[PDB]
């Protein structure tokens, strides 16, 4: 079978400014027909992907002429000069010369912008919860540029690892930056047999964390 | 003008099959080859195969030999895929594709788990300063996805959605939104936490 093989993962641009993407193939597309069938896709989150380029440059019809593909053989790129917002998303090189079918792994356009240190917020578990048996611990970390983000939870100075659910947003379309949800599920029981607990956000644009803490004797 | 148009989500148990369908409008059904592709994690995409509507002949990637079965009903302009036998790791997205257009995708979620509402938990402050942030925690439903829309709409540009985690079998996903505390709690904050799969909506006004 043959091997898209997409560079970069990720690609944080400004507005207007130019993108490109590699594909390399691990054999050739150019079709005993003559024709190179190598396609790029552009898939919007929410979407389906939606056809860019066929034929390693030829744009589909609707398609603004900022985006450029190239290439021959086992190498291409796309290139995309003055990317607008509606360009973010997620891009896939694909080979329609061979059987099976194959696609890149992606590349996905993202907005860059200035580093931002994350907003912290906790909250104990809901009254309402504890009736149920179960106990939620919720830390949010909100608002922070770059995506990467570490969450550390301590139970009394005592880090704690296991229950633990994190789960981050997609670049926010205003202000371009990340969030990201942390919640410590514990016992009704196991959440009783203690007294603080702390959420720490350790982000680049610190090198101490922000914490965040409760007691439960409050 | 061309469409594609598939068949609605579907949760169906470990061991059964699925029969989703890909409706054709605006062309001529049977002068274009339909594809269908695999999409995990709303990322990786596997190619499944092909068929040729006019005869009928399918070309399969050997890797859905046995697990896929292409079918076309010319008279009604409609493409199918069968999935046989299933397991969780056929999960996924499906989409199927003419050269140029792809049908919006059916979600298929094997597991043996029932359809479960969720419960839903207020996130208030028990602050200073002069915004607030406030949430609801969604836990325990079953299968994808819920809405959480926060005073009817009127919030979401300070609004975060966290996608869904599986937790014992069940999802748990979160909502936050910040508001400025001139307005909260001096006036109500509620999120509605819609799951079409079980026709349940819970509202929450969250209280200090
Ligand atoms: C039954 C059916 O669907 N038949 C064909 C499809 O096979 C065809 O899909 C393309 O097929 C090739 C292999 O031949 C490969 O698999 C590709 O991935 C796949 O897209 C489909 C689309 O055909 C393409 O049509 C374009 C017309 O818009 C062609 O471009 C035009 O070609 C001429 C030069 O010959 C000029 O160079 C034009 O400027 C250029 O726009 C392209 O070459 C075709 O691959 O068509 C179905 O009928």
């Known amino acids: 079978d043959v091997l898209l093989t997409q560079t970069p993962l990720s690609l944080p641009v400004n507005l207007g400014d130019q993108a490109s993407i590699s594909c390399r193939s691990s054999?050739?597309?150019?079709?005993?027909?003559?024709?190179?069938?190598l396609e790029w896709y552009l898939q919007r989150p929410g979407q389906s992907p939606k056809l860019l380029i066929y034929?390693?440059?030829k744009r589909f019809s609707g398609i603004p002429d900022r985006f450029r593909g190239s290439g021959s053989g086992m190498d291409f790129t796309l290139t995309i000069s003055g990317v607008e917002a509606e360009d973010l998303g997620i891009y896939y090189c694909?080979?329609?010369?061979?059987?099976?079918?194959?696609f890149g792994g992606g590349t996905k356009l993202e907005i860059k912008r200035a580093d931002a240190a994350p907003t912290v917020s906790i909250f104990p578990p809901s009254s309402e919860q504890l009736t149920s048996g179960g106990a939620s611990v919720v830390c949010f970390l909100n608002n922070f540029y770059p995506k990467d983000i570490n969450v550390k939870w301590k139970i009394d100075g005592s880090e704690r690892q296991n229950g633990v659910l994190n789960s981050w947003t997609d670049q926010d379309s205003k202000d371009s930056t990340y969030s990201m949800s942390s919640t410590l599920t514990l016992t009704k029981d196991e959440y009783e047999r203690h007294n603080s607990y702390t959420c720490e956000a350790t982000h680049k644009t610190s090198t101490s964390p922000i914490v965040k803490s409760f007691n439960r004797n409050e | 003008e061309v469409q594609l148009q598939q068949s609605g989500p579907e949760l169906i148990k470990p061991g059964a099959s699925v029969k989703m369908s890909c409706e054709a409008s605006?062309?001529?059904?049977?002068?274009?080859?339909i594809h269908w592709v695999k999409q995990i994690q709303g990322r990786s995409l596997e190619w499944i195969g092909y068929?040729?509507?006019?005869?009928?002949?399918?070309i399969y990637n050997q890797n859905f030999r046995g697990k896929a079965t292409l079918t076309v009903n010319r008279s009604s302009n409609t493409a199918y895929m069968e999935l046989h036998s299933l397991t969780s790791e056929d999960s996924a997205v499906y989409y199927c594709?003419?050269?140029?257009?792809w049908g919006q995708g059916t979600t298929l979620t094997v597991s043996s788990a029932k359809t479960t509402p969720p419960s839903v938990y207020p996130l208030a402050p028990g602050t200073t300063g002069s915004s607030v942030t406030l949430g609801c925690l969604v836990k325990g439903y079953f299968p994808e996805s819920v809405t959480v829309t926060w005073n009817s709409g009127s919030l979401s540009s300070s609004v975060h959605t966290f996608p869904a985690l599986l937790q014992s079998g069940l999802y748990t996903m979160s909502s936050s939104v910040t508001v400025p505390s001139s307005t909260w709690p001096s006036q109500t904050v509620t999120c509605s936490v819609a799951h079409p799969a079980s026709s349940t909506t819970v509202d929450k006004k969250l209280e200090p």
């Open positions: 605006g062309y001529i059904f049977t002068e274009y080859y």
């Open positions: 594709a003419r050269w140029d257009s």
């Open positions: 054999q050739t597309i150019l079709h005993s027909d003559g024709y190179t069938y």
């Open positions: 034929r390693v440059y």
């Open positions: 694909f080979q329609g010369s061979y059987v099976p079918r194959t």
């Open positions: 068929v040729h509507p006019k005869t009928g002949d399918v």
